[PDB]
Amino acid sequence: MAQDALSDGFVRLCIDPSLNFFGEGCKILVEGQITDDATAAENVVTCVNSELDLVE
Amino acid sequence: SDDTDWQENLRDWIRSAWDCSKPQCFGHGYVFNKGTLGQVLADGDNSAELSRLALP
Amino acid sequence: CNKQNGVKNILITFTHCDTGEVIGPISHEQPDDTLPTYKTCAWTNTALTNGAVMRSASNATMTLPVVRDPRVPLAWYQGCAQIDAQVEKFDGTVMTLTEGAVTEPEESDGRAVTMTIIAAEIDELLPPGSLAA
Amino acid sequence: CNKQNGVKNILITFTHCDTGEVIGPISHEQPDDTLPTYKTCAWTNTALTNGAVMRSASNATMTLPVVRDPRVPLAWYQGCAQIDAQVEKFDGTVMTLTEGAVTEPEESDGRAVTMTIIAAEIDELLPPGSLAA
Amino acid sequence: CNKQNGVKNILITFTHCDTGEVIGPISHEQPDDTLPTYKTCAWTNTALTNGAVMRSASNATMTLPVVRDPRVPLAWYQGCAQIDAQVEKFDGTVMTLTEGAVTEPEESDGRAVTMTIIAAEIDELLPPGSLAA
Amino acid sequence: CNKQNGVKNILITFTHCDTGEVIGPISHEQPDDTLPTYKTCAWTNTALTNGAVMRSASNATMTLPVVRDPRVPLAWYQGCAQIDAQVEKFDGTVMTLTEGAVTEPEESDGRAVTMTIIAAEIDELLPPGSLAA
Amino acid sequence: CNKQNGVKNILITFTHCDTGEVIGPISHEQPDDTLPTYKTCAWTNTALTNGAVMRSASNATMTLPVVRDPRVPLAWYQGCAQIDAQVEKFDGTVMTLTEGAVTEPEESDGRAVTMTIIAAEIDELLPPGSLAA
Amino acid sequence: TQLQNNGFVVSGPATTSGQGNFTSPYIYNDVTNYLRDEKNRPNATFRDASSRRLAAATGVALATFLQQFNGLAVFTKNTNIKTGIIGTNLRLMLGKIRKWASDNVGVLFSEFDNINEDIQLVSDFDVQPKCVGQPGVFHLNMRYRPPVRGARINVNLVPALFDN
Amino acid sequence: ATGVALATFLQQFNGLAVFTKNTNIKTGIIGTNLRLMLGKIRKWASDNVGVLFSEFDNINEDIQLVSDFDVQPKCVGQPGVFHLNMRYRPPVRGARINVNLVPALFDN
């Protein structure tokens, strides 16, 4: 049911701003020091998402 | 109403109406939060489905 | 054979305008390899600016080259008579015209005549299986 | 197959004006070796003195010679109905047109029809890897 | 080979007026055996009586038939963008034009485009050993 | 037996256009040592510059020299009837033509007739093991 | 042992235009003693006067008579497929052609087909010791 | 979702609200109760109700076309046909059937994946052993696919903003 | 609003013959192929500029159409299912302008 246009089920609609059509680009690896309060394990390659994920 | 738990339930319901698992029933909700500046800022739970009104 | 572009039958029925006598529908043949041509849309469009158009009256015409029948005066095949024509193409299409008039006749040697005819409306008969009403 | 200059598909949709009847997109085939032509820039320059120009409204037009479909009246192909057309070339280009109108129709023998169409805007889809946005 | 009459390189540089985009000096190839034609004298003469002449403004004109590049919209080649062209003949002559504009575009099937350009002046680079300054 | 190159069977079926009379398939034979010819491509290409080719619509044709059957009027073998032909070679290849038409007939002496049939499509049946769908 | 002039190998690879089907490099042979022909310069000149010449675009072509392979439809040996061919002579010269096309097919009897292939460029591999880069 | 995937028809109303007015339902999907196969191998050949209707139309149309071979002379031992005789043989019959199948593409069939293997014709003698076959009896094997029509479109809309 | 409007527009392809393997549509057939479908949608998106969208940064990359046969592996896709991906921007609200005020005492 829901709205009239989407009730018949011919069209499935998804709205999300976090999806990207283009494939992942080239990879850049950054290496350096850290402090004790860092939670990331040492000597492990890990992905990063945003600046706000830093510090912690 | 001004019950935070009651408002939280309303936000969850709206998310479902905007969900991708079925035909959508788009909607929006309006709520209010009252108190000092320190208290009001504590209710900002990053809800795109609500428009919180701040009062002194 | 349903893909051969050509004309099968041509029938004309004159009506003398000064005596009222009518000559029954006679058959005719072509003078050369050309074919008749038609225009069935009465109104005519013209190009305005930015996709608009102006609509004008115009008429429905027809061009019918046919061999003169040796039993009919050459005058009748020009402005001096009325015409009622029918053309049946090979595929099955039939074009009908009534109360037509000849316009701006040109000299003819006595065998080949290229009549230009105008009428209020021309009716078309499509083969079986048409889509539009 | 990417350097062959030719036409691959031609779809036309008719919308009768006196009855609002709509006929779905019907494929068509061209009558001869000539190709359609396009003009998509809806502004015309004229030459002033010393390299200056002067703009004017103009329109976007398309010339589409196609073979009449034997299931559609000949009047529709002339200025008695709306037209929506799409042409897909071999290389990959697609040109779309909507809400077009026929202008100054000429007589046709019954099979080969040449349509002049004018519209507010004509859209183009270049093959993958274009430069302009 | 210096006495061969032909064209060697054609470079064009578009500039979309509506968005300010600039496309580098892409190279082009010609569609048929015709060659471009030029007119580099700004003023024009007219014949009076007894050997006198009237002098009028006129412009400097160009005519560049070139195959459309499949990575550029067809609209740009018509009067919807600035043009900067250069043509290098086999003998060595190089002729440049900047800030040209297209005038009175005609319909093009999609491959062959014949641009008519006008500019304030055209600069000619004669081969080594010229006489005039 | 797989190398011999020659015709094995020929079948022809007529359909008079004016009356619709039909005659079942009849076996024919060749008048001399000349073999038929085919062209199963419906498109014809032309040579442009720089390797491009203009692609246009065309027909599929067959040239079939046969000996007139003494029970069929000569007129039918010429352009006064529709034809449906099949040719089987020794290699097993079988050509099939339906709804054909004779074009530009040439005068014949009453025994040997050369036919120029053109149809929208000719169907080929390769021996077992064809690599193409 | 090197003076011998003749073809040694012919490889052809097809690519159906409509469906994109691909067939590997099948080896072919010749029907008679008529060798292929080439033109590897994409420029055509003209007489003019006083020793001058007009230089135009033209193409590079190849005429390749081969024997039809019984596992490939005849249509593919005509204008209904893109072709990539290679020829190797006895001396060592190797001609390579890519993304070619067939122009103006001639009717064939089902065994021998003469192909007129034109492409933007043909690559020649001379024996060891070439003097020109 | 479960009912549709198990071969059932589900109907729903055209409008939804608490006003309590009248509404008319409509069919979501037109599907038969076909599942699995004669050999218990799953497929969806007869999922659409239109498939059954097309199968009946295809059978009748083919039967009418094949009627022309009734009483026609046939040759099976020596394939050559003497001049002037009215007849045919296996290969010529096969060619005619192939031509008919192609002509109906886009009307009753979708494009054949490999036409050269979807149609076969064999005489009775070749099948039965010696002195068991009968004259003038043919076995025809065919395999086709019904036309394909648009069924569903999935949209992944991704909004973005022009910052500041 | 965009979702509802777009869903309504695509309804015209419901129950329309689609050709995916051989893209040459015969004479008289009523159908379409991927490229023609994409062109029609591209026209619609460009037309709504100023009503539901702003100017697309690159209209040639923000719209894609792929048949399900080109996404799923061999013999796993379904006939007549497409995946449409679109990206858009709402109409621009405002702008920022830097103003450098500079009176001049010298006369030229």
Side-chain angles (χ1 to χ4, degrees):
Chain A
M1 293 180 183
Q3 280 192 319
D4 283 28
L6 308 156
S7 64
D8 60 3
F10 180 86
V11 169
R12 312 292 290 291
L13 198 148
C14 178
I15 309 184
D16 59 290
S18 66
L19 170 66
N20 71 320
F21 306 169
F22 322 128
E24 67 295 341
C26 297
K27 309 182 184 177
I28 182 172
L29 183 69
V30 182
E31 155 167 353
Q33 305 291 320
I34 51 155
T35 42
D36 292 344
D37 49 329
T39 65
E42 298 157 35
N43 299 321
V44 188
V45 183
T46 72
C47 171
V48 184
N49 264 313
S50 84
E51 313 96 297
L52 277 54
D53 281 15
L54 281 46
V55 188
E56 299 190 358
Chain B
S1 168
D2 56 357
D3 194 314
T4 318
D5 306 324
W6 196 350
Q7 293 172 357
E8 201 282 335
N9 290 11
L10 188 70
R11 188 210 67 191
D12 278 356
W13 166 241
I14 303 279
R15 277 188 198 274
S16 175
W18 273 82
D19 197 37
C20 174
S21 314
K22 49 164 192 159
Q24 299 84 351
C25 306
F26 310 114
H28 205 47
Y30 294 77
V31 304
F32 75 90
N33 303 130
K34 189 178 168 201
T36 60
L37 173 53
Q39 294 153 321
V40 177
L41 290 174
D43 302 340
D45 71 333
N46 181 23
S47 66
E49 306 87 6
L50 286 179
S51 290
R52 299 173 181 278
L53 176 67
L55 315 170
Chain C
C1 47
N2 290 318
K3 269 180 137 182
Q4 289 163 334
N5 197 29
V7 162
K8 201 168 181 176
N9 296 312
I10 307 181
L11 303 186
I12 297 169
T13 306
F14 312 95
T15 304
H16 202 261
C17 70
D18 293 8
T19 69
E21 64 205 301
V22 173
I23 308 306
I26 301 167
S27 173
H28 284 90
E29 57 165 30
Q30 293 179 356
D32 60 29
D33 63 358
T34 52
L35 294 183
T37 72
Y38 316 99
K39 175 172 86 77
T40 62
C41 196
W43 295 93
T44 293
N45 291 316
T46 80
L48 275 180
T49 61
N50 197 336
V53 291
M54 283 155 39
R55 190 172 288 273
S56 71
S58 163
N59 319 290
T61 63
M62 183 177 176
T63 311
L64 196 58
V66 285
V67 171
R68 184 271 280 261
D69 194 2
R71 306 177 292 157
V72 174
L74 171 59
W76 290 25
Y77 283 84
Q78 297 167 345
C80 277
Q82 194 181 256
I83 293 159
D84 291 331
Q86 285 187 273
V87 187
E88 201 206 310
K89 290 166 83 72
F90 265 104
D91 54 46
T93 303
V94 185
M95 301 265 178
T96 302
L97 188 146
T98 60
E99 302 197 12
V102 188
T103 62
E104 60 155 50
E106 90 183 16
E107 292 146 273
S108 72
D109 64 41
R111 177 176 165 278
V113 189
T114 295
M115 277 181 310
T116 307
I117 312 177
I118 69 181
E121 172 196 310
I122 299 190
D123 194 58
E124 182 182 38
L125 179 63
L126 292 149
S130 165
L131 283 168
Chain D
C1 61
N2 321 121
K3 309 181 59 41
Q4 286 155 350
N5 190 33
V7 162
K8 194 171 182 182
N9 294 302
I10 313 183
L11 308 187
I12 297 169
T13 312
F14 308 102
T15 298
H16 203 251
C17 65
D18 303 358
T19 79
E21 183 178 1
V22 180
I23 309 303
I26 314 192
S27 172
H28 279 83
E29 80 166 347
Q30 46 179 350
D32 65 49
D33 63 358
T34 60
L35 292 162
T37 81
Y38 322 111
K39 179 205 160 188
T40 68
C41 187
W43 279 105
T44 304
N45 300 303
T46 78
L48 289 181
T49 61
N50 200 322
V53 287
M54 172 205 317
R55 309 289 286 268
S56 66
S58 170
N59 291 319
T61 67
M62 185 180 288
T63 307
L64 197 66
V66 298
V67 174
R68 193 193 84 136
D69 192 310
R71 304 177 293 157
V72 180
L74 169 61
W76 288 23
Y77 285 86
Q78 298 173 349
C80 274
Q82 182 169 290
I83 292 156
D84 303 358
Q86 288 179 265
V87 188
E88 191 202 335
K89 304 172 84 60
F90 271 95
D91 63 358
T93 305
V94 179
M95 306 210 89
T96 302
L97 189 144
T98 57
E99 298 200 76
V102 184
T103 63
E104 83 188 6
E106 68 177 342
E107 297 166 287
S108 74
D109 63 358
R111 178 175 162 280
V113 181
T114 301
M115 273 184 301
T116 316
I117 300 157
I118 73 181
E121 161 196 340
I122 283 178
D123 200 55
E124 179 170 10
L125 183 87
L126 299 160
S130 163
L131 285 162
Chain E
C1 54
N2 311 68
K3 300 176 68 37
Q4 299 176 321
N5 199 31
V7 163
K8 199 175 188 168
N9 302 305
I10 308 177
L11 300 189
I12 302 181
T13 297
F14 314 103
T15 301
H16 201 254
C17 61
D18 214 347
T19 65
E21 293 179 353
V22 175
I23 305 306
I26 297 163
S27 168
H28 283 75
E29 60 177 40
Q30 47 182 353
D32 64 74
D33 63 358
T34 53
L35 296 187
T37 62
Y38 314 81
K39 179 204 162 198
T40 75
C41 190
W43 292 87
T44 295
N45 283 325
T46 297
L48 280 180
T49 61
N50 194 354
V53 289
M54 291 164 37
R55 200 167 173 87
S56 159
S58 177
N59 312 304
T61 311
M62 192 150 186
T63 307
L64 203 55
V66 285
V67 168
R68 196 199 74 145
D69 205 59
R71 308 177 290 157
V72 175
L74 171 60
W76 290 22
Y77 282 90
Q78 286 154 355
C80 285
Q82 193 173 275
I83 288 157
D84 291 331
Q86 288 187 274
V87 175
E88 194 209 302
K89 298 174 88 60
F90 269 98
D91 58 59
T93 307
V94 177
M95 277 180 306
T96 299
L97 181 141
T98 58
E99 308 207 5
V102 182
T103 62
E104 301 151 20
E106 58 171 9
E107 322 197 330
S108 71
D109 63 358
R111 181 172 157 283
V113 183
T114 299
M115 278 181 298
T116 312
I117 314 172
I118 68 177
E121 68 181 51
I122 289 180
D123 184 77
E124 191 176 0
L125 174 65
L126 294 149
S130 167
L131 284 165
Chain F
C1 183
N2 53 317
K3 196 263 209 175
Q4 291 145 338
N5 166 32
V7 166
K8 196 187 196 151
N9 294 5
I10 300 172
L11 298 184
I12 306 191
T13 314
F14 312 87
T15 303
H16 203 281
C17 275
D18 292 332
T19 79
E21 203 156 330
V22 181
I23 295 174
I26 305 167
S27 182
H28 284 83
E29 65 163 333
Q30 261 167 355
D32 62 356
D33 63 358
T34 311
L35 299 163
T37 66
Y38 318 111
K39 176 197 151 185
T40 63
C41 204
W43 309 84
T44 299
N45 298 330
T46 313
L48 293 165
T49 78
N50 274 317
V53 290
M54 182 179 72
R55 176 165 274 254
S56 55
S58 183
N59 302 323
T61 63
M62 196 163 82
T63 310
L64 191 66
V66 291
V67 180
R68 184 271 280 271
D69 182 291
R71 303 182 283 176
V72 192
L74 181 69
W76 288 28
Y77 282 94
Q78 283 144 310
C80 284
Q82 185 182 240
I83 291 155
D84 291 331
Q86 278 178 289
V87 191
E88 191 216 330
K89 312 219 295 159
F90 278 95
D91 263 348
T93 318
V94 171
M95 294 322 200
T96 298
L97 195 156
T98 50
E99 293 179 353
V102 190
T103 68
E104 272 166 350
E106 192 167 310
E107 294 171 334
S108 163
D109 61 301
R111 179 177 171 276
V113 185
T114 293
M115 315 183 70
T116 309
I117 303 168
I118 73 175
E121 171 205 0
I122 284 166
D123 186 74
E124 183 178 1
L125 166 54
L126 283 71
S130 71
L131 298 172
Chain G
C1 303
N2 47 308
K3 175 213 201 273
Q4 292 180 267
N5 161 34
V7 170
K8 186 179 188 177
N9 290 314
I10 305 174
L11 300 190
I12 297 166
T13 314
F14 312 97
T15 297
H16 199 312
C17 278
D18 291 331
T19 73
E21 212 166 310
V22 178
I23 294 185
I26 317 184
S27 178
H28 291 53
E29 76 180 66
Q30 293 179 356
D32 44 10
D33 47 19
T34 297
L35 307 167
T37 63
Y38 324 110
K39 179 198 152 186
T40 73
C41 179
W43 299 91
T44 291
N45 299 320
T46 311
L48 293 183
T49 79
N50 314 67
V53 293
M54 172 174 286
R55 196 139 176 185
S56 46
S58 63
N59 298 323
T61 75
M62 190 176 88
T63 315
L64 191 69
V66 294
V67 169
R68 194 271 290 280
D69 189 292
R71 306 181 261 149
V72 191
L74 182 67
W76 287 28
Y77 286 87
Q78 310 195 359
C80 199
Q82 175 174 280
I83 308 174
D84 291 331
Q86 296 179 265
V87 184
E88 191 206 320
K89 308 176 77 88
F90 273 95
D91 61 71
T93 315
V94 182
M95 301 315 218
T96 292
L97 199 152
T98 53
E99 293 179 353
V102 186
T103 74
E104 279 171 17
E106 263 187 20
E107 312 209 332
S108 165
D109 64 42
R111 178 176 179 272
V113 190
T114 292
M115 316 171 61
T116 315
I117 304 172
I118 67 175
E121 171 195 0
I122 286 166
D123 188 358
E124 181 185 49
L125 194 156
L126 321 182
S130 66
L131 296 163
Chain H
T1 301
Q2 267 187 84
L3 287 175
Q4 277 182 343
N5 287 2
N6 284 263
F8 276 93
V9 185
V10 175
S11 70
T15 59
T16 71
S17 57
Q19 301 183 283
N21 299 90
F22 290 122
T23 70
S24 314
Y26 71 97
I27 307 305
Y28 283 16
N29 53 300
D30 178 15
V31 168
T32 62
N33 200 230
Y34 175 79
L35 284 173
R36 289 176 288 282
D37 192 1
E38 65 183 1
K39 291 180 181 178
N40 193 22
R41 295 330 190 181
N43 64 31
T45 298
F46 281 127
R47 182 175 147 74
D48 291 302
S50 61
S51 287
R52 298 285 288 184
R53 310 198 276 269
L54 275 164
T58 298
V60 170
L62 175 51
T64 293
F65 167 85
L66 281 160
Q67 196 77 22
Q68 63 185 278
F69 304 136
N70 199 1
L72 183 63
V74 162
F75 302 81
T76 51
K77 300 137 201 161
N78 186 357
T79 43
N80 291 5
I81 304 191
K82 290 170 73 73
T83 303
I85 288 173
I86 295 168
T88 182
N89 51 29
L90 301 153
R91 300 289 287 165
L92 290 159
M93 269 212 285
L94 178 55
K96 223 165 193 187
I97 285 161
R98 274 201 31 191
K99 184 68 169 61
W100 174 82
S102 296
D103 264 18
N104 285 318
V105 170
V107 159
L108 292 176
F109 315 134
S110 190
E111 42 264 25
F112 285 77
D113 61 308
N114 192 5
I115 193 66
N116 304 298
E117 302 178 74
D118 292 11
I119 313 188
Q120 308 188 334
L121 190 71
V122 194
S123 62
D124 180 37
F125 296 134
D126 304 307
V127 183
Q128 311 301 344
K130 174 72 201 193
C131 288
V132 175
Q134 295 157 113
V137 181
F138 296 99
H139 297 298
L140 180 64
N141 297 325
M142 201 185 218
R143 194 32 59 200
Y144 73 93
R145 310 154 145 189
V148 160
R149 318 176 98 71
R152 177 150 74 71
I153 314 191
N154 316 325
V155 184
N156 312 314
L157 186 63
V158 184
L161 176 64
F162 183 84
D163 199 340
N164 282 11
Chain I
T2 289
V4 171
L6 178 60
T8 287
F9 173 82
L10 293 181
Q11 208 78 35
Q12 68 188 269
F13 307 121
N14 190 350
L16 201 65
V18 164
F19 299 82
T20 45
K21 208 198 76 154
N22 193 329
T23 54
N24 286 1
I25 303 162
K26 289 196 159 207
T27 310
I29 295 285
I30 295 165
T32 198
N33 52 14
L34 293 192
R35 297 289 295 180
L36 285 160
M37 299 204 49
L38 176 49
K40 221 173 194 186
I41 294 162
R42 187 177 178 288
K43 176 90 189 281
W44 170 90
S46 168
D47 198 319
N48 272 265
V49 162
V51 176
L52 294 163
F53 312 138
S54 71
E55 292 84 31
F56 285 78
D57 71 88
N58 197 2
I59 177 57
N60 282 291
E61 291 176 350
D62 276 8
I63 310 187
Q64 305 179 352
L65 202 79
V66 298
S67 62
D68 197 46
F69 288 122
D70 291 306
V71 166
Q72 306 288 3
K74 175 82 181 93
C75 289
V76 183
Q78 325 205 330
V81 163
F82 313 96
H83 304 268
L84 163 61
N85 301 315
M86 161 165 289
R87 192 206 301 221
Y88 78 103
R89 305 177 138 75
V92 71
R93 295 288 306 296
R96 275 180 97 100
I97 289 172
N98 292 323
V99 176
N100 288 294
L101 191 59
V102 56
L105 271 292
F106 200 71
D107 50 36
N108 202 1

